[PDB]
Symmetry: D2
Subunit: 291 residues, 4 copies
């Protein structure tokens, strides 16, 4: 099952695609629906015709329906430095270091992984909506990541594409600026669907692709497979929930492996496109904040 | 006006003390009430007798009413290293450093202050309720701080006492562990009242006192005045709201100046008592989390 | 306990007077409060000062509070011809008769009492508000009646004063017009309080007084005691609930004994005043409807 | 457009059939939907497949959906004696009479029509649900009637079939018993659809058919056309709303022309079937109330 959501005349409607391309309009709240499917694979609703899912993916709007965030995640959390190359996330001198070894280098090996708070729902956007670059950032990069939807016990309810938008220049100036670099209006995008757990045989065998498009131009193109992830998702979940209650429908984003260069900073009117196998392609325009 | 709130048979009731010791039961939501007073000093409600505020402060419960968090803050944010001595927040080698200078040392001077995400409302507790020490922390300290209640424009609606409970050992191991050290069930307490802006002539002239009590014993006693704060509150507010919408009733906690020693780690059954001039004394029992 | 309710800035607040003239502001819905008192005499709320009940009775408004209907009764039902003299309710020829005996004459004796539907809550008014005379009525009379508040089982939760406003001319033309004569905007008023069951030792020993005031002038004055009621209230309740569910807070009005003459028809600007022992005095201005 | 409603796992869902047999699941409340269609013929929702309307009509339930009342009418009102033959509604002596002429005879001619209060929503049932015979009734008859759905101004939003269930024996004993004879649990049924105003060219040219079925047996069969209605619907509406606000979605039932004989009283397990042209057939089992 693949869940999506549209806004229509100020109200939300949720939908699900079943393997055979048939669309079901949902009776329940989409988070409730994900919890139910997790149990017995039951889906409550009616089969609809005239909802053109493929056109929604391409055009964002048809008639008076517009695709958006597939759910409102009460909380969003991130995980850091979960790939081999991620040790080198900012290799240049000026990095913070613990006795000669950099903070990122140290955390890559350490028993305890990095976990940070990413976003509240109102700070998130979806397919076809604008992500944002801070007014005081000179170097902001999108981070293509696989993300899980969780229940309150830390059980995986589904998978989706997330963009961990990061003001990389601010983080570099001082690791104490990390929350400012990560948390703001439009700092995060996800979708276009949430896929149920059975839609992915092996989460550690999916292609993640990032393209940045500037005035028709492919400004960057990069691809890494999830078989290169060295810190497993279950361990990330484990540390996130320890002494820390998370509500149903929380999203954990599992860290990036694709890092554009210092000169590949995002700017106004850019188009970020992120693809993951079996999920789809998340497309977001870019908008620079004014002082 | 000083606002407090009680839970009574599963429902909330808000109250306000006016200068002349008279108690008013509020008609409106306490956040709405704070916004209104901010405008014209109007308070909607009825004068009550038989609500013994002084006894509530001492005993927490009388009959079937219990004092608690005076509001539900939709978000709580913290500010870091805002006092002269705070450069030395963990002076010992092993600290992360940028070209010989430590991260805390650097941020104390830098134009940009430290701002981090502290808590969601359900992660907060109030007067007479238990704060918590993480199951995997060997060194947790309370941070006595002055905190402001804000509206969505960043206007100060009032002041209160906050305890920025911190797993200091985790932060020390790696500054990337800071969110884990700061954000969890019972990581934050505030109250016992919120005082309106006019109740404090000068926020930069108040005594903050911390006492930790172990089995009747004064395990620690420390006091610093707010005239020692080097980073003003308005600048902290400025950086918090930049490209970052905050809902009405958000709390910003302004940083601590009282730092107990490495051996003064909190443990089960401890009692933390925090006093600030004109506000009152916040009292919370301590509870250690089990693995 | 005596319950009243005020509207204040578009919202309701309920209050109760206890024997010793002390005022309690209620925590619960007033219907819920009546149900609870019915059980164990428990009242949930805070004692207030500065609510001048006696002034409310006289002046209707003080500052920004106005007295109104003490509850919203989901349904209001009436009982007919429950007094000895009520056989003569319209004695003049032209009355409908069953084999020489009039319909009212017949129902006075018959095993089955008269029960009719009186009003929905939005068709009711309270102390100090305008009752209404139909645009097409040439002869409308107020009917001073004792009324009970009931729960869903038909248990008496309290007593109050009701005015069964009746377009008597329409009823006289044809008994099939009775619902039009009885049910309309402002066809019904009650209050100013609801008194709990223990506030009345004997419901069959209370003085009911009707006065109609026209431009300072006592246009009518009449008084009958409830010891003259020949059809008991419990029997009226019995027939009302038979195969007929009534929601909590339903009001049954028990029939009138005071019937002004054919020439005493109500008109614009009139003031109806109804007094019952131990309850109080219901005062309503009169307003004639325009075609 | 023809509206129906199902209950499914404790929640309601509304649907509409468009001329071409296509089913639309509604976005809005069905009363809101009727008001909108009344304006510009706009319908908000999605086309569905797998909702078998014809099977619902026949079988009441399929899988986990059950047809019921198409709306919750906040109020239901009735009109009386609107057909030529209705003068003879109980011709036998013992009838109430005004100077030799019976009450029904008088009201048939009189400028003012009969209007009475019929039911609250919780006293109503729909297609496939049980109507009821009072425990103390020895002669109850169904009254097949055309009914209008109205807005607050008295504008016709649609048409439907209603059964004005009447304890005829109680009415006959005394016209003052009419409300007891008319208003009770299960005193009223309507459906199975509401048809929009354009679905009926002439309301005064429709066949109304009543059949009562006892153990497979046609116990009664009767049919009258609406071209025999002598009191027009607009006049009934006019008198209903005069000085009398009615909420959106109120139903007025326009009076019956089919009156079974004194021996045709309903009993337990009976099946009442009512047909009107262009609307459909309302089917309700019968259940006798126990003392
Ligand atoms: Mg990331
Ligand atoms: Mg702190
Ligand atoms: Mg009366
Ligand atoms: Mg009828």
């Amino acid at each position: 099952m693949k869940l999506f959501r549209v806004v229509k005349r100020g109200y939300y409607i949720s939908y699900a695609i079943l393997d055979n391309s048939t669309i079901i309009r949902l009776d329940e709240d989409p988070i409730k629906a994900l919890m139910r499917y997790s149990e017995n694979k039951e889906v409550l609703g009616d089969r609809v015709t005239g909802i053109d899912y493929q056109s929604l993916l391409k055009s964002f709007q048809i008639n008076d329906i517009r695709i958006t965030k597939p759910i409102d995640p009460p909380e969003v959390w991130g995980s850091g430095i979960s790939y081999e190359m991620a040790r080198e996330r900012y290799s240049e001198e000026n990095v913070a270091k613990i006795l000669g070894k950099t903070i990122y280098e140290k955390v890559y090996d350490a028993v305890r992984p990095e976990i940070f708070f990413k976003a509240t729902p109102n700070r998130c956007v979806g397919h076809g909506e604008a992500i944002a670059v801070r007014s005081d950032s000179e170097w902001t990069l999108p981070e293509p990541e696989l993300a899980v939807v969780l229940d309150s016990n830390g059980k995986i309810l589904g998978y989706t594409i997330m963009d961990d938008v990061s003001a990389r220049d601010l983080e570099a100036e001082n690791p104490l600026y990390l929350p400012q670099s990560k948390i703001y209006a439009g700092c995060c995008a996800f979708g276009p669907v949430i896929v149920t757990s059975d839609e992915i045989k092996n989460p550690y065998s999916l292609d993640i692709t990032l393209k940045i498009v500037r005035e028709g131009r492919v400004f960057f193109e990069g691809s890494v497979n999830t078989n290169k992830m060295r810190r497993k998702i279950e361990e990330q979940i484990q540390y996130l929930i320890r002494d820390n209650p998370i509500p149903d429908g929380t999203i954990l984003t599992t860290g990036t492996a694709i890092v554009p260069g210092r000169d590949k900073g995002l700017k106004d009117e850019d188009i970020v496109e992120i693809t993951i196998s079996n999920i789809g392609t998340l497309i977001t325009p870019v908008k620079k904040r004014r002082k």
